[PDB]
Amino acid sequence: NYIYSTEVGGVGGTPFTFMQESGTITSIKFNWSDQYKLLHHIEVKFINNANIYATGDPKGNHEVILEIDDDETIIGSVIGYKKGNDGRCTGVKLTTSKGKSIMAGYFEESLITTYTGKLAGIKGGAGSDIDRLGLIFLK
Amino acid sequence: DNYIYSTEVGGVGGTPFTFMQESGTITSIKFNWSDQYKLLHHIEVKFINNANIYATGDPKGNHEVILEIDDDETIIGSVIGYKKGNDGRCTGVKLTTSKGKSIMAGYFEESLITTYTGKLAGIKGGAGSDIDRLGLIFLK
Amino acid sequence: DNYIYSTEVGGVGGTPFTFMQESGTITSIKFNWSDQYKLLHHIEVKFINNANIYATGDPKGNHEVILEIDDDETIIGSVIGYKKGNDGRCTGVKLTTSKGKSIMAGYFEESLITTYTGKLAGIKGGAGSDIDRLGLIFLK
Amino acid sequence: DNYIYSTEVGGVGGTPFTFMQESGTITSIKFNWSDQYKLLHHIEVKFINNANIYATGDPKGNHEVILEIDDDETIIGSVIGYKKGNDGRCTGVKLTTSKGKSIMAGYFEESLITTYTGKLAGIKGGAGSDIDRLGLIFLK
Amino acid sequence: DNYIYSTEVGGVGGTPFTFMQESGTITSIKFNWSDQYKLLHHIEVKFINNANIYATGDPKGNHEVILEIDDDETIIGSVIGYKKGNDGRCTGVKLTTSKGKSIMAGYFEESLITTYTGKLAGIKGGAGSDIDRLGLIFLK
Amino acid sequence: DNYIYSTEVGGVGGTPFTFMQESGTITSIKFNWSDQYKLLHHIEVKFINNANIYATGDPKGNHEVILEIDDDETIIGSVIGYKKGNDGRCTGVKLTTSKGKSIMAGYFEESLITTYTGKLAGIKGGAGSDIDRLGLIFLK
Amino acid sequence: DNYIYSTEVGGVGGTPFTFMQESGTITSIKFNWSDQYKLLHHIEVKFINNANIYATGDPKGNHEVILEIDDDETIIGSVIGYKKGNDGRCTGVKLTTSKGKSIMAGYFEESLITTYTGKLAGIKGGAGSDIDRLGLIFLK
Numbered sequence A: 001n002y003i004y005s006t007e008v009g010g011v012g013g014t015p016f017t018f019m020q021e022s023g024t025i026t027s028i029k030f031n032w033s034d035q036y037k038l039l040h041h042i043e044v045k046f047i048n049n050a051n052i053y054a055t056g057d058p059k060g061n062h063e064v065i066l067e068i069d070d071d072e073t074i075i076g077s078v079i080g081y082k083k084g085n086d087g088r089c090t091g092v093k094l095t096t097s098k099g100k101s102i103m104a105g106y107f108e109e110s111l112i113t114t115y116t117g118k119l120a121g122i123k124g125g126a127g128s129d130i131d132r133l134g135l136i137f138l139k
Numbered sequence B, C, D, E, F, G: 001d002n003y004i005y006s007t008e009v010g011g012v013g014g015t016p017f018t019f020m021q022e023s024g025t026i027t028s029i030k031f032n033w034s035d036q037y038k039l040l041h042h043i044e045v046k047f048i049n050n051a052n053i054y055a056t057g058d059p060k061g062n063h064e065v066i067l068e069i070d071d072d073e074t075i076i077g078s079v080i081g082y083k084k085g086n087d088g089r090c091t092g093v094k095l096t097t098s099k100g101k102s103i104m105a106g107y108f109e110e111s112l113i114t115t116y117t118g119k120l121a122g123i124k125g126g127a128g129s130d131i132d133r134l135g136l137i138f139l140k
């Protein structure tokens, strides 16, 4: 019942997989730096669940939060990254079925335009930086 | 509840405030901010069928904006700018309505939240000299 | 009432005025303003079925705009620029209508209100050499 | 009446004129203007079922525009540029129609009116060397 | 008649032409103009169900444009540029159709007419070396 | 016939060509052109249910574009650039389709035609070294 | 067939490749390109219900883009840039989807094709160091 968007970036970091069965993401936060031009930290909240699921080191000078209504889908989703085994996530642009949008970080090397739908989860690897990030949707 | 609570953004400082009125919605909201500090300093809210002005923070800035909200008019677009961390502050609010009205108060230099939308019902957070933290409240 | 009263913005100065005619609406309004002082100085209003011209302020400014309003035309966008505080003044008005007509008078360098919308019935406030204060009035 | 009179804008100077015909609407209108003075100098009008040209003003300008109006075509947007005061003059006309046709005559540097909309039926004002003052006339 | 005659614009010079066919409409029109004189010089017109080319003027210009018109396609926008006066000339034509097709011929440096609209049925005016004068003709 | 013939624009030179297939529409068209001469030099065409390539002119140009046409896709906009006269040439083609596809080949510096529209069925004209003339063919 | 083959554009060089799966469509496609050479160098494709990655060409470029395609998502706009001739190369791709998604890879300085549209089923062409030749394949 889930669609796994391609994980983009490098092979480094501590693995993460955040997905509650019968739930969807109600809030997502991205943390990035002007110093490295990288995403560093991600936080996620699910419906009817106050717990925050986090990865990465929140050392960046900027963060954006997107709140998602229960009937709201992602209709546009771009992740910017540096490719190769030594790849990092650099940016994210999300647009919703209600015209809400967020833009984090930088888009200077490689891009992926992912699958659309109801955002259910995230998987990847993170340490000091977001090495790699894949979105997960409902089928 | 019958209400959606958007995340409070900013620091942990100042005196807590909650502005909500049983079976009531915001008909008017006022933001005060300074070019000197690039922060919101003061917020004022009025509800439908209630002439009382509910205020928090110190009205010391050189700019103010007021948004009046028709009884049927909703928020379709909402951004709050803030400085993140325990020591944080709310720096700015952009609202757009179901009738093409829009306001821009203060600054959006550090962190942003794109909040939940709907019929604006209340606000909560903390304030003293400054708005330390701000979260919107909507009907279901 | 059968009226919505938008906030009076600006100072407490000048002679009070209320332009409202029972069972009538504003067919014409005129805004006079100066580049010298960047203030509104003078406002005239004509109502439906009334040849009488209601005026307030001193027509001292070097610019004037007139908006004519069709009987079935409403305001869908309204911003008033003003200097806040007791010594305040109303500095500018932008109006847009249900038919794509729009006017822009004066300056928007200090505070702003995005008012209520609807069928413009009347205006209230205070004036002398300048428009000290302006509130719009709409039908429910 | 069965008519709407838009405000005559400009000066008190020149010979008065009123162009209207029983059960007849404007089928054509011409505006003469100069780059040297940036005024309207001359207006001509033809009515439905009437080959007579009604003209006023001194046709001395280096530009002219004609708008032809289909029998079922209305004015949806109408801006007249003018210099305010007793020594005033009409400086420009922008008209936009129900079928997307549009003309621009003259200059818009001092004062503007956005008039009423509808089926153009006549014009009135005063002209000598220049168009001192112009008001539009529409069916109810 | 069953015809609308748009104003003939330009001077009184050259040889008269009138191109119309009973129960027919313009399927093609060609405008020849020059960068040297910034004038139209030559016009050709073909009618529905008729192989004949009706031409007037001197084809001496360095540019031509052709608009082909589908049987159900009307003119929704039509602008003719000209020099006014007895010694006048026709300088350009812009036409836009019910299908989004358009053409621009020549220059719009002096006077302009926004014409009547509808199904293009014919043209009349005067021509010699130049197109002195041009009017359009439409069905009712 | 069951076909509409757009005007052949260009000159009288080259070898004639006519590309049409019984019960067959154009599925692919290629334009070759030079920056050196600012002309079309070569055209290739394929029809529905037919793998043969019909070609004319010499492919000496440094640019090509291909348009592929879905079976239900029509041309809603079509401009051919040319040099007029007996020694004329085809210089450019702009096509826009019912699905928002569009190509632009070559140059539009001298003369233009906006052609008939519909389902492109074939082409005719003449070519040798260059495309001397080109006319489009559509279904009724 | 049940397949529409767009023209393979570019050179005759490289190792031929054909990526198609019986009763399957493309779910992901990656283009790798260089600013140094302004060519595509490498392509990867994944099909519905199939975890295998089909690659061709040499991934030596400094940029990559991935377009993921929803199961019901089609191609409504498709341009490939290329150098024509026996010695040719693919230089760029633009894809636009039924859902407002788009990618742009590489360069468009010489020749273009606007291909057929629909549900993208596969690709074919040749590749070694570079993408010499690319053709898209759609469902009927």
Ligand SMILES: OC[C@H]1O[C@H](O[C@@H]2[C@H](O)[C@@H](O)O[C@H](CO)[C@H]2O)[C@@H](O)[C@@H](O)[C@@H]1O
Residues within 6 Å of the ligand: A011, A012, A013, A014, A015, A126, A127, A128, A129, A130, A131
């Ligand atoms: O710590 C285990 C983890 O370390 C290595 O990845 C890096 C670190 O997590 C940290 O320093 O930050 C780097 C940037 O975020 C990150 O690449 C790898 O050896 C990895 O495989 C391992 O899991």
Ligand SMILES: OC[C@H]1O[C@H](O[C@@H]2[C@H](O)[C@@H](O)O[C@H](CO)[C@H]2O)[C@@H](O)[C@@H](O)[C@@H]1O
Residues within 6 Å of the ligand: B013, B014, B015, B127, B128, B129, B130, B131, B132
């Ligand atoms: O809202 C800001 C801040 O206000 C209050 O703390 C301090 C005092 O108001 C005053 O003495 O000036 C200080 C410098 O601006 C100010 O911090 C408290 O309400 C505090 O908790 C709050 O964060």
Ligand SMILES: OC[C@H]1O[C@H](O[C@@H]2[C@H](O)[C@@H](O)O[C@H](CO)[C@H]2O)[C@@H](O)[C@@H](O)[C@@H]1O
Residues within 6 Å of the ligand: C013, C014, C015, C127, C128, C129, C130, C131, C132
């Ligand atoms: O409208 C502003 C102001 O106008 C009137 O006072 C005027 C000003 O104070 C100043 O221009 O000096 C004038 C000369 O004596 C004076 O009229 C008053 O109506 C005031 O109440 C009003 O605020």
Ligand SMILES: OC[C@H]1O[C@H](O[C@@H]2[C@H](O)[C@@H](O)O[C@H](CO)[C@H]2O)[C@@H](O)[C@@H](O)[C@@H]1O
Residues within 6 Å of the ligand: E013, E014, E015, E127, E128, E129, E130, E131, E132
């Ligand atoms: O159409 C222009 C003009 O053509 C004919 O006379 C011309 C003018 O004298 C002048 O512009 O130069 C021409 C070159 O020899 C000359 O013929 C007449 O038909 C005239 O009435 C017309 O205005």
Ligand SMILES: OC[C@H]1O[C@H](O[C@@H]2[C@H](O)[C@@H](O)O[C@H](CO)[C@H]2O)[C@@H](O)[C@@H](O)[C@@H]1O
Residues within 6 Å of the ligand: F013, F014, F015, F126, F127, F128, F129, F130, F131, F132
């Ligand atoms: O279609 C252009 C032209 O091509 C052929 O003549 C050519 C030109 O004179 C010139 O470019 O030189 C060429 C090679 O030496 C020569 O063939 C003819 O087909 C002619 O009819 C045509 O108009």
Ligand SMILES: OC[C@H]1O[C@H](O)[C@@H](O)[C@@H](O)[C@@H]1O
Residues within 6 Å of the ligand: D013, D014, D015, D127, D128, D129, D130, D131, D132
């Ligand atoms: O029209 C401008 C001007 O022209 C003339 O000098 C007279 O007709 C005046 O009465 C008039 O004000």
Ligand SMILES: OC[C@H]1O[C@H](O)[C@@H](O)[C@@H](O)[C@@H]1O
Residues within 6 Å of the ligand: G011, G012, G013, G014, G015, G127, G128, G129, G130, G131, G132
């Ligand atoms: O892709 C460029 C080039 O790469 C290799 O050298 C071979 O497969 C060639 O035939 C090809 O043209």
